[PDB]
Design a protein around this ligand. Structure first.
Ligand SMILES: OC[C@@H](O)[C@@H](O)[C@@H](O)CO
Ligand SMILES: OC[C@@H](O)[C@@H](O)[C@@H](O)CO
Ligand SMILES: OC[C@@H](O)[C@@H](O)[C@@H](O)CO
Ligand SMILES: [Mn+2]
Ligand SMILES: [Mn+2]
Ligand SMILES: [Mn+2]
Ligand SMILES: [Mn+2]
Lengths: 493, 490, 494
C-alpha cells in the first residue's frame, strides 16, 4: 500500500569538555555507524548532528517532531552529554525514541586504554545519565544495549523500527466506517476521540450509500480488468468461471473491490469497517473485496470494529505486510490432548495468512440478507503467531496479546464456505481463554504470523496504553494480579 | 403526548420492636395518613408497610428494584430503626432513594409530651442514624427535611419526583441513530457502552436506508389536515404549487420516523445531514413535531443530547424544552445575548409565537428545500444543559439563563430561534462553559430547574457543574479541578 | 538600559471547514486579517497565520508554533464550526501558551439581514464551544477570553495574558547563574533544579564565586571610572561617598563587581543569578549596589543562592515590562493596631525600580558576609497595589503563592537604616495573610511587583502546570486551608 519514505534520525550526544577535536572523533564514529547500518531496516538511518548544547538538542527534536519522514529518533550518548541539556528537547520529542546504549569500539583496547580513550568512549556512563533523564521525565522509550555491530542489536533495532513506522502510520491513520456498530454489540464500541488522542486515529463514518454510489459508477470494463487479475491469482470454484452463473456474484465483489479502493484511495483511508446491518445500495456484503484490500495493506474490522481495523493496518505495517489478518474465534476443538481454536469470519479473512493458494468460492449468506457473496477460501498457515485485541475499558484502552501456535488442519472442511485457520493458544485453550476473558479481549482480533509480542508491547509503550500478554508462562492467578496492578498504574495517564 | 408508565413512589417507614406492636400500629397509621394526604394532589405515593427487620427491609428493596413502576423509594425513620438492619436492603437498592426526614406532628405538644411520645416520634434521631448508614454506604440520595405537610417539603419532593421519573425513563431509554456522528466532530462523540452503564441508555445506530424505506409508505396526508389545525402557513401553503411537496415531504418523514420510533420503542433519535441517502429532505419539521410529543432529538448524530432532551422533557412534563444550539452572539454592551437555533430542528414547545411553516433552501446536506417550524422563542428564567464525555466519565454542564423577547424581528432568518441572556454574563458564562467543555448542542428548558439536573447527576453518579448568577470563573476552575479528583475512578 | 527581549510575536490562528465553499474561507481570512491589523493598532505584534481547515493544516501551524522561537503564544479562534477532532493532532503537539479567543467579527446581530449564509459563516458561538470541548478533553491549560474583538476589556485581558506568555517564553530560555551554593541549613531556597527545568524551562547551574571573583579582577579601572560617571549621572551620594570621599572606595568596588557580574552574565546569556554571603572568597564585598543596578536593568536575582526567586524576579520583571518589580524579603513587622505593616528589604539587594525616593548610594558596615562595607542603593519603596509572590518546592511539585498588598509611603523616616526598604499592608490583614502565607509554606524571599497582577501569575502557573494560591482581600484562612488540601489532591498526579 506504500509507506512514506520513513527514516530514523540518529542523534549523538556529547559535550565540549574534551575539545572540538573529540567532537570530530564522535561525529566520525557516528557517521561510520549510520553509513554501515545503511548497507542493508528497510528504512534509512539518517545521521544528524552531534549535539552538545541545550539549543542543538532542542532543535533536532523540534525538527524530528515536524518532519513527517522521521518515524523515530535514535539517541546515543557517545561521551558524557549532561542530561539537563536534553530536558527541553526531550519535552518536545513526540516521535518514538530509542536509546541505543552502545559504543564504537567493541572491546576494551587493553594496551592503549588511557584517559584520552576514557574521555572519548564513555557511553558506559554517558548513556546512564541520559537514561536517568528520560526516566525522570516519565518518557516511554526503547532501550537496547550492545555493540552497534552485534547481530542481536540489529535484530532489536529492526524490530523496533518496524514498530516505530507503525506508530507513524498510526499518527496519520484514517479509518472509514461504512455504517455504525452492530447494534447492542459492546466491545466494538469505544471513544474514537480517545483513540485519536492516544493513537492519532481519525476514525471516519460515512453512510453506506456513499459507498453504494461509488460502486455504481464502476465501469464494467474495470470489472473485466480485475477479473483477469483474479484469474492470475486465485483458482475459481465451479460455476464462478466467466461462464457459470456465480460470476455475477464474483463480478459484484470485484465491483465492490473497485468502488471501495476508489473510495479508500480518495480519502487517504488506510483502514475501514463494514456493517452487515447497513448494506443499502449494496448487492453483497463486502467479502473477497475486503479480503483483497487487506492483503494489499488495508486494515479491516467487521461490524463497525474500527479499533481492530486500525489495529489490523498497524500490525500489517509491522509485519512488512505479511502473515497478518483480521480474525474472529468461531468455534473450539475441545478434544483432550488436541484442543484447538478455529478462527474464521463471515466473509473477511485476508489471504496473506494462507498456506493454500486462495480459491474464489461463492456461497449463500444468511446475514444482512443480500446476494450470495464471493470470497477467498483457504486454510491458514502454520507456525508461531500472535492474536491481538485492542479494547476500550472506558477510561483507557487495553491491548491483549495471545501468543498462539497455528497448525496445519488435520482434516478437510469441504462444507465450510469461508477462510479458516486453526491454532492452539498458549499456554492452553483452557487458560488462554480464561485469561483472555478476564482481560476482556474482543472476539475480533488481529491474527499475525510476523508481528512479535515485543513489537506490540513496544507499540503499547509508544502509545502509552497497557499491553497484557497471554503466552506460555501465563498463570491465571498472577495474570489476575497483573490486571489488578496495571489498572492502578494506568489511571490518569 | 408520549406516555410514561404509571410511575409510583414507594413510601417506606422504618421502625423496631423495642416499643411494641401497638407503637407499630401507630407508625403504620401515621404513614398511611401521610401517604393518603399527599395523594390528594404528580405520581401516586404508595405506602409500602413499616419495615422493622433486615429481611423486611431487604424485601421491599428487592421489590422496588424489580417493580418497573417504582421510580423512587421514599424512606422515613419514624422511630429509631437500627441502621445495620438497613444495609442489605440499601445495598440492593438501585432506584432513586429519597430520604424524607420528617415527623408526623408538626409541633412539640408541650403540655402533654411524655416518654411514650418520645419513644414514638423520634425521627429526630432515627433519621440521623439512617442518615449515617446511607452516607457510610456512599449512596446517592436526596434528603428533604421538614414537616410532611409543609408546602416547601412538597415542592421539593415534587421536584425530586420528576427527576426520579426521568431517571426511570433513562433506564428504559432507547435511542436510534440514523447515521454516525457528523464528521471530525468531537463533543458529540463518546462511549455508548459507558453511557449505557451510567444512564441506562441504549444507543443504537440504524443506517438511514432503514428510515428511508419506512417513509416510502403513506397515509394519504391526514397529517396535513392537522398541520393547518396547528400552524400558520406561508406561500408554499396547500395549493402552494411551489413548495407544498416540501411540507408533504416532512409530513412523509414524520410518519416514517414515528413508525420507526414507535416500532422499536425509541424515545429519542438523531439524524446526521451527511447521510441522507433515500431522504428527499434532511428531517426538520418532522423532527420538531416528534420533539413536541416528548421525543429527544440530537442533530449531527448527538445521542447524548438526544437522550438529554428526552429526560429534560420528562422532567419538564413535556413543556418548554428543546434541543438547542448557540448559533451567534449579540455583544452590544449592556444588552449581551445569544441567539440559539438549529439548522431546522427547534421544538415548538419553547415558542411564544404561533409556529409558522416555511420552506427555505438548505445548502447543508445538499437536499430539497426543507419545511420546518419557524417561530420566536419565549422569555423567562431557563437552563441550558450540555452532557459531555470527558473520556473517563461524563460531565453534566448546566447554565442558568434569562430568555428575552426579541425587540427586532429577523424576517429573513429561515429557522426557529430563541434569545437569552446567560447568567451572570455572556463573557463569564461562555468562559465557564468553555472551561467546563460544554457542547454546542444543548437541551434548553424553561421548566427544568438546576436542582433537578443536579439531583439527576447524583442519581446517575456523575458530576454536574452549574453556571449561574453566583459563578466566578476562577472559583469555577477550582470546582472543576476538585470535582475531577473526586470523580475519577468512581 | 534594560535586559533585551527577543522579538516575540503571537500567532492568530482561525479554524473552519470545507462544508462551506471556497468563498466563505476568503471572508474568514479577511475577517481575521482585519482583526489582527486593528490589534497591531497590544504589547507584542500579532501575526495572522492561516485559516486552518484540515488535520494536517492544524498540526503544521502547531508544529510551527513550537518551533518558532519568536512565537510566544497561539491565539485560536473558530470563525465557523471547525470540527474539533481535527484539532487533536495539533493541540497535542502545541507547547506554546494557548489563548482561546472566543469572539465574533460582527459585534451585533444584523436583525434585518440575518439568514442562513450569515449563520453559516459567523458560527463561533458554537464553533468555539466545540473547540472548548476538545481542549478541555485533552486537559490542556489555556486562557479563554470572550468578547467582541474590538472590546476594550478584551484588549486589557489579552495584554495581560500576552505579557504572561512572553514571561513564559523567557522562562523556557531562562538561564540562572548561582555564584555559590544555598545558604547552609536553609530549606525554602532549596529545591529540584531538574524538576524546575522540566516545569518552567529554567537552566540553573552553579559557578564557583571564584569564577566571578576572577572576572571582577579583570575589570579595568578605566571602565570603573566610566561607571562612577554613570553613578553620578543617576544617584545621590551620602556624605563621604562620591569621588574623593573616604568611603568612595566602597562604591568603586561595587562598580567593579557590577561590571564583572554584567560581563559574566552577558557572556553566558544569563538573565538571573544568585549570590550567597556565605561564599565570598575573592570578592571584597557582598554584591549589592551592583545587584541593585543589574535587577534595575531587568535581571532576576535571589539572595542566598535562591534560584527559584531569581527566576521568579526575572519572569515578573518581564511580565511587568521592567517596571516596579524587585526581589524582596519580609524583614520586620509594624504591629501597631490599625496600622499593621511589614517592612520589606534585603541586606543590600533591593531593586530601585520600586523606589519612590531617588536612590542614594550609601556605604555601611555589614557583619553578615565578613567582607568590606558594601555600597548600595537606599530608598523608600513607593506606594499602591502590588503583589508579593513566592515559588516554593513542596518536594513533589512547585507551588506559587501570591499575596496582594498595598505599599505605603513611610510616615516616619528611618535615619539609621542602611538599606533600601518598602512598607506594605498585606491583604486582607497582616495577621491573616501571614497565617495563610505560613500555611502555604511561603518563602521569606519573594518577588515584589507593582505591575504584575495576580491574574498574570495565575496564568503563568496555569501555563507551567503548577498550583498557584492567592492571598488577598477575599481570602479567609479557613477556606484557604481547604484550598491547599483540595489543590494538593489535584496537583499530586500531574
Ligand atoms: O564531562 C564528564 C566528565 O568528563 C566525566 O563524566 C566526569 O568527570 C565523571 O563522570
Ligand atoms: O427510645 C428509643 C431510643 O431512640 C433508643 O433506644 C436510643 O435513644 C438510641 O440510642
Ligand atoms: O454543529 C454545529 C452546527 O450544528 C452545524 O455543524 C453547522 O451549522 C454546519 O456544520
Ligand atoms: Mn465479527
Ligand atoms: Mn448542530
Ligand atoms: Mn470513555
Ligand atoms: Mn535573604
Amino acid at each position: 500500500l506504500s509507506l512514506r519514505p520513513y527514516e530514523f534520525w540518529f542523534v549523538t550526544g556529547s559535550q565540549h569538555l574534551y575539545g572540538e577535536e573529540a567532537l570530530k572523533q564522535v561525529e566520525e564514529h557516528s557517521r561510520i555507524m549510520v553509513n554501515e547500518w545503511n548497507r542493508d531496516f528497510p528504512f534509512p538511518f539518517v545521521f544528524k548532528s552531534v549535539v552538545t548544547t541545550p539549543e542543538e538538542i532542542r532543535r533536532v527534536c523540534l525538527e524530528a517532531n515536524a518532519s513527517e519522514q522521521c518515524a523515530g529518533v535514535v539517541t546515543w550518548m557517545h561521551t558524557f552529554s549532561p542530561a539537563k541539556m536534553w530536558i527541553g528537547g526531550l519535552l518536545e520529542l513526540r516521535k518514538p525514541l530509542l536509546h541505543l546504549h552502545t559504543q564504537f569500539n567493541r572491546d576494551i583496547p587493553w594496551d592503549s586504554i588511557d584517559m584520552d580513550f576514557m574521555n572519548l568512549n564513555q557511553s558506559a556512563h554517558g548513556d546512564r545519565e541520559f537514561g536517568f533523564m528520560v526516566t525522570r521525565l516519565g518518557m516511554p522509550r526503547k532501550v537496547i544495549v550492545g555493540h552497534w555491530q552485534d547481530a542481536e542489536v540489529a535484530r532489536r533495532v529492526r524490530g523496533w523500527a518496524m514498530t516505530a513506522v507503525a506508530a507513524a502510520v498510526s499518527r496519520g491513520l484514517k479509518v472509514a466506517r461504512f455504517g455504525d456498530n452492530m447494534r447492542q454489540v459492546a466491545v466494538t464500541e469505544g471513544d474514537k476521540v480517545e483513540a485519536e488522542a492516544r493513537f492519532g486515529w481519525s476514525v471516519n463514518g460515512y453512510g453506506v450509500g456513499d459507498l453504494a454510489e461509488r460502486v455504481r459508477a464502476v465501469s464494467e470494463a474495470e470489472i473485466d480488468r480485475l477479473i483477469d487479475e483474479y484469474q492470475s491469482l486465485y483458482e475459481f470454484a465451479p460455476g464462478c468461471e466467466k461462464g457459470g452463473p456465480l460470476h455475477d456474484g464474483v463480478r459484484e465483489q470485484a465491483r465492490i473491490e473497485l468502488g471501495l479502493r476508489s473510495f479508500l484511495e480518495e480519502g487517504g483511508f488506510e483502514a475501514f469497517t463494514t456493517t452487515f446491518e447497513d448494506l443499502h445500495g449494496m448487492k453483497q456484503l463486502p467479502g473477497l473485496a475486503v479480503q483483497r484490500l487487506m492483503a494489499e495493506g488495508y486494515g479491516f474490522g467487521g461490524e463497525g470494529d474500527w479499533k481492530t481495523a486500525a489495529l489490523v493496518r498497524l500490525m500489517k505495517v509491522m509485519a512488512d505486510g505479511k502473515g497478518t489478518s483480521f480474525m474472529e474465534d468461531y468455534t473450539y476443538h475441545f478434544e483432550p490432548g488436541n484442543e484447538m481454536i478455529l478462527g474464521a469470519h463471515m466473509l473477511e479473512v485476508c489471504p496473506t495468512i494462507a498456506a493454500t493458494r486462495p480459491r474464489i468460492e461463492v456461497h449463500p449468506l444468511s446475514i444482512g440478507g443480500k446476494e450470495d457473496p464471493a470470497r477467498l477460501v483457504f486454510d491458514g498457515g502454520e507456525g508461531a503467531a500472535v492474536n491481538a485485541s485492542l479494547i476500550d475499558l472506558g477510561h483507557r484502552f487495553r491491548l491483549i496479546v495471545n501468543e498462539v501456535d497455528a497448525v496445519k488442519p488435520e482434516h478437510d472442511m469441504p462444507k465450510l464456505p469461508v477462510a479458516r485457520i486453526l491454532w492452539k493458544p498458549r499456554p492452553s485453550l483452557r487458560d488462554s481463554a480464561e485469561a483472555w476473558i478476564l482481560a476482556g479481549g474482543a472476539h475480533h482480533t488481529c491474527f499475525s504470523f510476523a508481528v512479535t509480542t515485543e513489537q506490540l508491547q513496544d507499540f503499547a509503550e509508544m502509545a502509552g496504553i497497557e499491553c497484557v500478554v497471554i503466552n506460555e508462562h501465563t498463570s491465571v492467578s498472577s495474570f489476575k494480579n497483573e490486571l489488578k496492578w496495571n489498572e492502578v498504574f494506568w489511571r490518569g495517564r
